[PDB]
Amino acid sequence: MVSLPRMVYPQSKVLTPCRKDVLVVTPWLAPIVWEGTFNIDILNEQFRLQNTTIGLTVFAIKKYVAFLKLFLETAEKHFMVGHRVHYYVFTDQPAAVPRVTLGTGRQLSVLEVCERRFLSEVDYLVCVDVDMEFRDHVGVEILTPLFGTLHPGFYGSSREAFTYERRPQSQAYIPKDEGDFYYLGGFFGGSVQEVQRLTRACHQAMMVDQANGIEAVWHDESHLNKYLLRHKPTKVLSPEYLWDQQLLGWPAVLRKLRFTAVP
Numbered sequence: 001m002v003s004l005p006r007m008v009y010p011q012s013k014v015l016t017p018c019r020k021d022v023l024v025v026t027p028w029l030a031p032i033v034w035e036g037t038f039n040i041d042i043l044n045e046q047f048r049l050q051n052t053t054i055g056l057t058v059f060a061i062k063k064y065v066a067f068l069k070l071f072l073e074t075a076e077k078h079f080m081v082g083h084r085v086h087y088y089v090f091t092d093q094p095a096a097v098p099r100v101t102l103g104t105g106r107q108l109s110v111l112e113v114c115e116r117r118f119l120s121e122v123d124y125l126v127c128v129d130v131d132m133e134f135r136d137h138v139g140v141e142i143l144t145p146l147f148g149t150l151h152p153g154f155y156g157s158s159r160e161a162f163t164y165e166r167r168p169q170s171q172a173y174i175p176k177d178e179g180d181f182y183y184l185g186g187f188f189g190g191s192v193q194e195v196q197r198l199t200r201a202c203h204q205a206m207m208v209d210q211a212n213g214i215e216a217v218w219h220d221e222s223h224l225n226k227y228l229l230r231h232k233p234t235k236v237l238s239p240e241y242l243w244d245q246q247l248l249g250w251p252a253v254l255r256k257l258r259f260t261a262v263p
């Protein structure tokens with residue numbers, strides 16, 4: 001709750017949009033995070049004064065443990081640098097986790113495969129896929145009670161084309177005339193409380209489907225989209241936050257490619 005210190009930065013013009021090529025705010029007034037929309041110095045101050053701790057979770061089972069080295073190494077260079085970070089690696093191969101050198105204020109926990117511990121160790125949880133690498137800044141601008149990320153392959157598509165689950169028998173069902181955006185199952189997060197609510201809701205929904213003998217078209221991602229349709233995220237991250245350059249190139253609307261798939 002402490003006041004920010006004196007800071008010097010250019011004034012923002014009220015009669016000048018920051019981006020004229022993209023939507024920077026949703027209909028429910030949640031910002032859509034694109035490069036140019038935020039002053040990272042102001043945001044860093046706000047979150048540091050709060051002594052914010054960010055938890056980053058990844059699952060690495062079977063062959064996916066081979067992606068951990070690059071993932072963690074690049075995270076050390078681009079993820080929440082300057083803030084307290086706690087990595088949680090869930091794996092079936094504890095002894096296979098690479099020994100990565102971490103900067104100060106950052107720690108790593110290996111969990112072999114207790115929601116209460118999250119509430120006690122971190123303020124925010126970020127959940128992502130491990131077969132990726134950070135290529136640019138991914139900082140506190142993403143922190144909020146609940147956020148989803150615009151899928152790189154559908155940010156420009158009409159909702160009818162969104163690959164939501166379309167069968168009424170599934171708990172993840174979303175009709176052709178509903179839907180705001182198509183979010184990624186591989187990059188979401190928010191406060192520990194909101195994240196656990198989302199995962200708990202999706203777990204229950206998937207069990208109901210299982211009992212009914214049906215599996216959503218895109219599994220977890222399908223349910224996450226249904227959850228975020230009914231519980232609007234407080235921030236939405238642009239595709240800058242999860243991209244595949246090999247498959248999608250580098251469009252003009254993307255000033256930075258922050259987190260990407262590994263070729």
Ligand SMILES: CCCCCCO[C@@H]1O[C@H](CO)[C@H](O)C[C@H]1O[C@@H]1O[C@@H](C)[C@@H](O)[C@@H](O)[C@@H]1O
Pocket residue numbers: 152153154163218221243244247261
């Ligand atoms: C219009 C063309 C779309 C190109 C992207 C397809 O991405 C895939 O989308 C489905 C949902 O419809 C699901 O999310 C898997 C996703 O594929 C993964 O992510 C993309 C970005 C690539 O990295 C693929 O190699 C991945 O398998």
Ligand SMILES: O=c1ccn([C@@H]2O[C@H](COP(=O)(O)OP(=O)(O)O)[C@@H](O)[C@H]2O)c(=O)[nH]1
Pocket residue numbers: 059060064129130131186261
């Ligand atoms: O049949 C599958 C394929 C992937 N995954 C999970 O999805 C993550 C990344 O997904 P994928 O292998 O599809 O790669 P990506 O789409 O992220 O590039 C992996 O860590 C797994 O935990 C899964 O549960 N089932």
Ligand SMILES: [Hg+2]
Pocket residue numbers: 057125126127195
């Ligand atoms: Hg998580």
Ligand SMILES: [Hg+2]
Pocket residue numbers: 198201202203205223224226227
């Ligand atoms: Hg859900």
Ligand SMILES: [Hg+2]
Pocket residue numbers: 199202203206220223
């Ligand atoms: Hg689930």
Ligand SMILES: [Hg+2]
Pocket residue numbers: 198199202220221223224227
């Ligand atoms: Hg989910």
